[PDB]
Assembly symmetry: D2
C-alpha cells in the first residue's frame, strides 16, 4: 500500500516503538532495515516480521557503524528512501547531580546519533536523486524543560532544532525532514523511569507511572500503535508538502 517498494532504515528497531514502526512499514509494502546495537534481537525481529525486514548491526554513536548501516541498505534494498532516527536513551538527575557521563552518553546517542545518521542518509538520498523521507523521534521533553530531566529534555530540544535546520537544508533535494514527539508510552522502560522519579520525588514504586498515565488528557498512557499512523503518513506521498515540522502524537500531553 502506502510505502510500496520503499527501502527504510529505523535505528534502534529491535524492540518497542522502532519495531512497531518496522512492522507497520512492512505491512505498507516497505523493505525495512531493523538497525540495532542488539543485532541478535534485530535478527530475531526480522525473522518474525517477514522477508521484507532484514537485520543491520548499528551503533549510531560510531561514524564507521553509521556508514556501514547505510551501505548495508544500499547492498540489500538497492538504496535508502526512508530514515527513522528512533534510537534514544533516557536519564534523569537534578541539576546539582548531573554527571559529564550522563551528558556525553545522551548527547552521543540522542543528538550526534540522529544528526550523523540523518547526514549519512541525506548523502545517499542526494546521490540517488529520487528524494527521500527522514523522521526524527523528538518527545514532549524537547517541547519544554523539567526540573529533573535537563539532559534528556535538552537532547530532544536539539532534535526539534536539527529537524527544522535539516528540513530547510534538504527540501531542495526532495527530502522531507520532520519529527514525531511522543508523550508517555507504556513499556519495559517505565520500571527505570518510575524508579528514577520515585527516588528524587520520594514516591512509592509505580506511583509516578500511574499518575503520568492518568494525567494524559486522552485518558491513558501511549502505545507504539498510537504512533505507527503518523510514522507511515510522514514517510508517504500524502506528506510531500510537510517540511521541518515536529508533530506531537501524545493524547494532548503537549499542544504545539
Amino acid at each position: 500500500k502506502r510505502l510500496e517498494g520503499k527501502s527504510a532504515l529505523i535505528t534502534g528497531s529491535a524492540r518497542g516503538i522502532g519495531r512497531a514502526f518496522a512492522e507497520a512499514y512492512v505491512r505498507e509494502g516497505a523493505t525495512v532495515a531493523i538497525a540495532d546495537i542488539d543485532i541478535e534481537r534485530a535478527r530475531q525481529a526480522a525473522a518474525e516480521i517477514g522477508p521484507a525486514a532484514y537485520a543491520v548491526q548499528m551503533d549510531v554513536t560510531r561514524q564507521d557503524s553509521i556508514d556501514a548501516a547505510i551501505a548495508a541498505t544500499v547492498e540489500h534494498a538497492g538504496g535508502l528512501d526512508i530514515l527513522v532516527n528512533n534510537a534514544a536513551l533516557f536519564d534523569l538527575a537534578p541539576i546539582v547531580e548531573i554527571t559529564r557521563e550522563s551528558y556525553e552518553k545522551l548527547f552521543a546517542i540522542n543528538v550526534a546519533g540522529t544528526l550523523f545518521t540523518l547526514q549519512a542518509a541525506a548523502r545517499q538520498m542526494i546521490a540517488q536523486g529520487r528524494g527521500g523521507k527522514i523522521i526524527n523521534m523528538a518527545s514532549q521533553a524537547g517541547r519544554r524543560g523539567e526540573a529533573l530531566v535537563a539532559i534528556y529534555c535538552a537532547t530532544k530540544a536539539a532534535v526539534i532544532s536539527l529537524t527544522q535546520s535539516a528540513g530547510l537544508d534538504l527540501i531542495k533535494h526532495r527530502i522531507n525532514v520532520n519529527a514525531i514527539a511522543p508523550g508517555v508510552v507504556d513499556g519495559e522502560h517505565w520500571d527505570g523511569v518510575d524508579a528514577l522519579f520515585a527516588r528524587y520525588e520520594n514516591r512509592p514504586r509505580g506511583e509516578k507511572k500511574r499518575l503520568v498515565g492518568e494525567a494524559v488528557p486522552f485518558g491513558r498512557m501511549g502505545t507504539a500503535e498510537d504512533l505507527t499512523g503518523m510514522a507511515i503518513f510522514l514517510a508517504s506521498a500524502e506528506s510531500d508538502y510537510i517540511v521541518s515540522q515536529t508533530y506531537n502524537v501524545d493524547g494532548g500531553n503537549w499542544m504545539s
Copy 2:
C-alpha cells in the same frame, strides 16, 4: 477506504480547499455535507463529486443556520462523525487603518463561526456516543503576527487556542479536535491578497504572489491537494491519539 461509512460536514466547501477536502473524503468512503453560504455552487460541487456529496446551505455567522446545517446532516447521513471548520475570510490593513467592520466580519466568520459550529457538532457527537473528529483550519498567520495582517493573524491565533481548549474539553467524549495550518495556497483568492499587499507595500500586481511562492522552502506556492492527506489522516483512526494539535502543512513556511 479510510473514512468508510463516516458522515462529514466541511464549512465553506463549495470552492477551493474545502471542496478539495470534500472530494478526498468522498474518495475515502465518507458521506460529505458540502456546506456553504453559496448554496448554488455547493449544489454544483455536490453534483460533480457524486452521490456521497450533498449541498447544505450554511452561514457560520448565524446560530440558526449552524443548528439547521447540523440537523440537515442528521437527516441526510444519519449523524455527524467529522467536522472540518474551513469557512474563513481574509483581510489586510495597517493598525491605523483597521476598521471595526473588518474586525467584526473576520472575528464573526473565522472565530465565532468555527467556535459555534464546533460547539454544535460536539453536542451532536456527544448525543450519538460514538466519538468524533473535529478539524479547524488555522494558518501560518495564527503562528505569528504580520504588520499588515493584525486582524486575520489574531483570528487564526484564536483558532489555534480554541483547538487546544476544545480538544482538552472534548477528548473525554472520544472527539479529537486538531487543526491544519496551511502556508500560502495558490487560487482565485490571491487576486485580492496580492492587490492588498500591492497597495500597502507599493508593488506591481502579481509581485507579492510571485515572491511569496518563491520564498516557500519546498519551492512553490501550495495547492489544496498538499492538504488533503492531512485532512484525511486527522479524520481517520490513525490519528486517534492526536489531541489539541495544530499541524503546519506549508512547505516549511512556518516550523512548529
Copy 3:
C-alpha cells in the same frame, strides 16, 4: 526616575494590577491616567496615588469612550507616551455551555478593547512624532488552551498575536508594542475566579486558588508587585530594542 515627564494611560486601573502599575509609574515620575468604567473607584485611586494620577471614565468597548479618553489624556498631560491595555474580563465554561453572551463580552473587552485603544494611542503617538511604549496584558491563558477556559484563553491568544502584528507595524514610528503574561496573580478578582472553577470542577471554595498558588514553581501565587518591574522596564529606554514580545512573569507557570 525611569519614566520622568512621561504621560501614561492604564485601562481598568482603579483596582488590582492596573492600579499597582499606576502607583509604580507615578513613583518613577510619570503622569498617569487612571482609566476605568467605574469613574468613582478611579477618582478614589487618583486621589490616593497623588497629584500625578488623574481619573478618566473609559469604556474600552466603545469607540467614542476610547477617543474621548485619549483626548482627555492629551488635554491634561500634553499628550500620551505610554499605553497599558490592562482592562480585561474573565469567564469560564466548558465547550457545550459557552454562550454567545460570554464570547461577545470577553472579545469586546479583551480583544476589541485592546486593539482599538492600542489603535487610538498609536494615532496620537504618530501625530506627536516622539515614539511611544504600548504594553498589552496577556496571560498564561494566551500561551495554551484549557478545557474550561476556551473563551478567555482565545482572547489572550489574540492579544499575543495583536501584540506581534502591532509591534511590527508601529516600530517604524519608534512605538514599542510588547505584552506581559502573568500566570496566577492574587487580588479581589480571585474570589470570582475560584468561584467559577469551584462551580464547574465541583471543588470546595478556595481549593483551586490554593492548589493554583502551590503549583507555581516559584512557590506562591503572584502579586501585582511581582509585575511592576517588567511594567516599568517595557515603558523605559532600557527596552527600546524590544519589539513584538510577550514576556511571562509567572514564577515558572509557563515557559516561553
Copy 4:
C-alpha cells in the same frame, strides 16, 4: 545602583556582549569576574572597566577550569550572586558538510560549558543560602532552525531547554535561571559570521551583514547596549518572580 554589592562572573566577557554586560554591571555597583580563555584580553578589559572588574582565566569546556573560576570568584568577591553564561562559538555549514569537529567544539562550549558552569555556580549559590541569578545567552538561532546553521541552532535550542529545566529545579534555592535571546548584534565577530555566509551562500563580503541589519523590524543591527538593560533587569530584584524564561531582545527579529 541596582546590583550594589553583588558578585557576578560573566563567561567570555573580555570582548563583545559579555564585556558590555561587565561594564554595565560595574556601573550598577556589581563586582564582576571578567572570565575569558584569553587571560590577557581579560586583564586589559578589567583594567579598562575599573577596580570592581577582575580577570579570571577560564576554559568553560574544562571542569577543573570551571571549578577554579568559581573558586577565584569566592576568593576575590567573597561569593557568587550572578552568573552570565556568555561564552559561545559560532560555526556554519550545510548538513552534508557538518564535521564531527564542528559538532563537538560548539556543543562543548555552547551547551556543556553553559550547563557545567551553571551547575558549579548553582552549587556555590546553594552553599551560600542567599539565592542568586543565572542568565544564559540564547539566540534567535535557538528559536528556529536555518538550513546552514544546524549545529549552532541546536546548541542555542539546548541552552533554552536547559534554561527551562535549571530554572524549575533551582527556584526552590531562590536561584532565578532565565535567558536573553539576541537577534543580530554588531561586533568584531560579524567579520567572521558574514565571511562564513559569504562563503556558503556565495555573496559579496558584507552583503549578509547589511541584509540582516536592514531586515530587523526596529530598522538596524543590534548593539550590546541594546541588551544591557535586560542583563541588569534579570540580575535585579525587579525580576525575582521571573523563572525559566527566554526573553528575545532582537528588534523584533523573532517573536516569542
